[PDB]
Amino acid sequence: WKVLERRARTKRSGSVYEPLKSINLPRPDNETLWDKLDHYYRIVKSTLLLYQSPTTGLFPTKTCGGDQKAKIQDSLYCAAGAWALALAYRRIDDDKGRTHELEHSAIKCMRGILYCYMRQADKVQQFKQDPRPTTCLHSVFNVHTGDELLSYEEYGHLQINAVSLYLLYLVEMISSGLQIIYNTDEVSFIQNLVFCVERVYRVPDFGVWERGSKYNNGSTELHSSSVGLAKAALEAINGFNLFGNQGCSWSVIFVDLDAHNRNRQTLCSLLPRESRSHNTDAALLPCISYPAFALDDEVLFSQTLDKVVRKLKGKYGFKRFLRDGYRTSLEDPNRCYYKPAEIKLFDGIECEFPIFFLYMMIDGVFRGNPKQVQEYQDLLTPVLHHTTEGYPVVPKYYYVPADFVEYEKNNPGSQKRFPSNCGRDGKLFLWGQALYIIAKLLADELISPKDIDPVQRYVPLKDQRNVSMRFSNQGPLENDLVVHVALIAESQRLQVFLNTYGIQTQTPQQVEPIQIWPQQELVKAYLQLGINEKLGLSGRPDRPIGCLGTSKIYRILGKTVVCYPIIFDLSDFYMSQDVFLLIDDIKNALQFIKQYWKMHGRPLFLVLIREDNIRGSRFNPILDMLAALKKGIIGGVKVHVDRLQTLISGAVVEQLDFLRISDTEELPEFKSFEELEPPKHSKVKRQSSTPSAPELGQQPDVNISEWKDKPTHEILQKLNDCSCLASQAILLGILLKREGPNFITKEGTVSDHIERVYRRAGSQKLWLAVRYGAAFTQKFSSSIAPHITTFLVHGKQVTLGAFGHEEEVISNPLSPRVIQNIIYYKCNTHDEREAVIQQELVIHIGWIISNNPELFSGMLKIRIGWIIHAMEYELQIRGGDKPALDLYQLSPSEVKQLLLDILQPQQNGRCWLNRRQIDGSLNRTPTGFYDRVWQILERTPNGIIVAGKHLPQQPTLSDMTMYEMNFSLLVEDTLGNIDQPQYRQIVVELLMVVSIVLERNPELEFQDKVDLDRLVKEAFNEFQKDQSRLKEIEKQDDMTSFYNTPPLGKRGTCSYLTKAVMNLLLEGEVKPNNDDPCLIS
Amino acid sequence: LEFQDKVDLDRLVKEAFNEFQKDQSRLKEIEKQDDMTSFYNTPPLGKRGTCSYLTKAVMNLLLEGEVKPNNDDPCLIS
Amino acid sequence: WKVLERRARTKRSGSVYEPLKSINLPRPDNETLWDKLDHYYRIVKSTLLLYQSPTTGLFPTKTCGGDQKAKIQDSLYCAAGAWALALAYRRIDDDKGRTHELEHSAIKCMRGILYCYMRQADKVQQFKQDPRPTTCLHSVFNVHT
């Protein structure tokens, strides 16, 4: 180092003036880099590269016995290790022809994987349309011929993490510089593979462990690791060029932002756990380590790492997950599936995998924590095995001997475990060996972290500034996005009308170089992208484009393209006839764009103004919204308004060159948006608002319970001579139900008449009539399915059905056709207006949870019918002495407003009965109440019975944990049998009191099963006796006076509840705790 | 829970004795007898010990009075 | 930081399963980045950007006495300061039209230096052939013309 190097003080001491360089610096232990690299090359060639089939380049999973199966993940890891060794050898000019061999080792493995995948193209086509385990790509192929080996009935073959890892590794090696993909057919295949990958967030997967779940009963559940790997692969493949340096504009892969956003939303909420049944697992390590680096949070990552280290760490290695029976002593090697209560026997004897020590060392090296790397190196050193030549071997796992299982269970970690079959000479673990080679290369500073991560998957805390779709320029802790807003008016007349009121707008005739397209044209253009007639490929499926996809600017066939959001188009529903709903939707879209924008450059937003919604009393809200837009801030979001030509100038454009490459003889025509010519008959020059009052009021005089058995001629005459719109619509509904839609009426066919009545009622703003028409037409909105899938993404279940009747649970995402069938074929016994109100409610709640998820904290499942019952009760209570008006005529604006008023966290004021009814209908529970239920369940034998349903104690404890979401679902299902919301709240209050008493008094225990109904009845009796003694009131039935009592206070409900609980508890045995020093008590 | 007014031990002892006498009469069909010769023989822990009657009586007295919720504890609706 | 951020142990102590994010982390001394950047902008405007000739954009070496000389290195360093301040301001979306002004200031200083150098092309030609102090580019130009 400095001062020591010079040592040139020939005479005493003095200042020296001469170059020192660095070659003359003292050198460490005398060993050239060539010797170390040759040693690594030897231990690689003799152990890892020795097992590779030249025909396909696929590494076999077994090194003995002539096994033909070969996994994909192991081959990918071996290729990664070979590529790392090639990068290590790259540092030497005279390589003696060794870098090329390892580089093509990686190349050949990747090409074999690609060939095996491309042998199944019909499987890709089927998975694109209906992704199911029966129609998924195989994960195990023959090691000699590249042929399928195991059928769907014995392996499942549903593994997406392998595909995601393959794509990410391909991106990494191509970015580092390689030649893997040759022609355009491979480009199309990879593009359609990415298309299949886009829809990971809905389909359950078997997971990396190929078991499916802890129970191992052939069940598929969503896994955090798979979602994270898919998100990382999508991030890497966005805008990436597969041809390397020698590439053009027609070799790029385009990724939809909506799928990435959905994956991120589905990941960032389930990440603290692994799945519904797995609280923690060791498979989360690759998701947040060197494979993926898909967690850009640095707090959730720390929490997950701490949880994993606290739970699954062992001295031999890391267990896969708690209660695992993989190759354990107690496992029975003749049955593929497990049994209920069997997994309890696998506690304390779980196997440990040493490869997670290598994973930890790699993560520590990447983060820059030498102490952790050294500690894990010392921990991993004694568990290594050497061959005859001395080459280290990493055992696959360690298993307890069958004789010592009892001793291990009594005191974990005391006994000595035995190495697996692949932990000595003769059998080897290629994945573990490649991991060890990579870890040793990285820990010895032979590989820089940048060399193995060209795409910069991992960034430090000081570099989370400018990454596409990962961080915004402001940073990861700030969001003040500014949205560019351009106003578009249809005709010059509308532009003049807006300009006369201080609003400046541009028309399509004034932006001639700029073409405005709807979403359909963009969808059609993206459909033509993935066309490959040689293999058979349909390209991108016909799906709508979200707000994120419509915020860019595209250049198609040399013409710039701008697309307005899907909010501005209306197809069949009457929700677009309210300007307030449009304003709410545009505000929600602006907030969603601001919250979930991570691209480069300000997003472009187009506003469409239609003459149909500036007419009448609705002109003022539109003018106010336009003034707010012009001011600069709308709904807490800052916006900028300027000319479109200036905005598009100097901005980043999107290139769609695949259209030119298409071999179609005739180029498809796209209809851009056009200026609307003015009428030559009426010549309406955008007149004033003119409120006026050409409306009347009358209630319908006919109900379905009366005009049912009346004859055809009389009902036809009544329809002819009547004028009420709602009464009319009722008569046409009856006519369609009985006489058929094709019946010929006085004014034409029935259906035409009902459509015309719906149209005029919507024009005249008669909500009852339009809702009746929509109910009788069985009309459907395409926005329900995205709302339902967003509901299911957030981990919240939805149930449709009338209050106090049959309901259906949507466990998993499903096609819109089945949703329509369920909604319109399960409410036949009730009025069809329930379906329409359910659609409105589900859309509103979906939008609210998309924008404000905090409003729904504490509730798991959403019941539309119970919320409607609470809606009606709230309308009644605001009615007071005067009866409530109606629920089906208050209009969607007031429906949403008073629904928001219902959704308030607290409603102090009116008596506790109303609050109890509202809370019970909304299905709101205290935080952690399910943990209290679990504690009671452990401390209460024989289970708990309520509302007829009985919940057992043995299988729940033996199969299931404290924090498992399965317990949440089971408790919700058990407690949902109660029909009265107030009774449900009484039950939950009793459960909370029981939990508090049990925790505060550990000595007491329940002798037998507890029946909550008996305790409720005893509380009734005690409260009635108290009231009769206090006021001399004769005993009365029904809960009508018990709910009104405040829960806490003087003679509250809680007091009677705890009195009954203690009376029951003291009836049983009292076991004294010897630990407590309280004597003679 | 707090005591509303002054406590008197004789009343609690009498109530515990009456509860024990009623329990014995129900269990073994034994007529009520004066003096606590049988009450003292009961062990102070286990099945229907004297501790159970004493804690039942004191809890019944406590729940008669007002219950003040502590805002420090995060337990809600309790 | 970690462990301190959660503070969600409502009942004694136990493992929690909920997102924590980083926005809820404790914040240092409360001061918006806009306020500090505005303070820096005022300091720059009142001291450095005040003395700049509109004709050429060359910063004068003297702030008083009506001196006409202007060095090149000082102007380059002033442009460096303006560019650095603009880069610092670039982190905000709503700059109120301030980043563009400093980006200009840098552009104008560079263009003034370039114009002053371009005014002497025969000097460059002579420097190419026989580099001598008598045939070298000038280093001090007029601040106004």
Ligand SMILES: Nc1ncnc2c1ncn2[C@@H]1O[C@H](COP(=O)(O)OP(=O)(O)OP(=O)(O)O)[C@@H](O)[C@H]1O
């Ligand atoms: N009316 C709408 N309002 C808002 N976003 C919409 C609307 N219609 C479609 N989208 C967006 O378009 C995409 C919807 O995709 P698509 O309709 O193909 O099905 P999905 O969301 O994958 O699920 P599902 O199986 O329920 O249809 C999502 O980005 C959704 O946000």
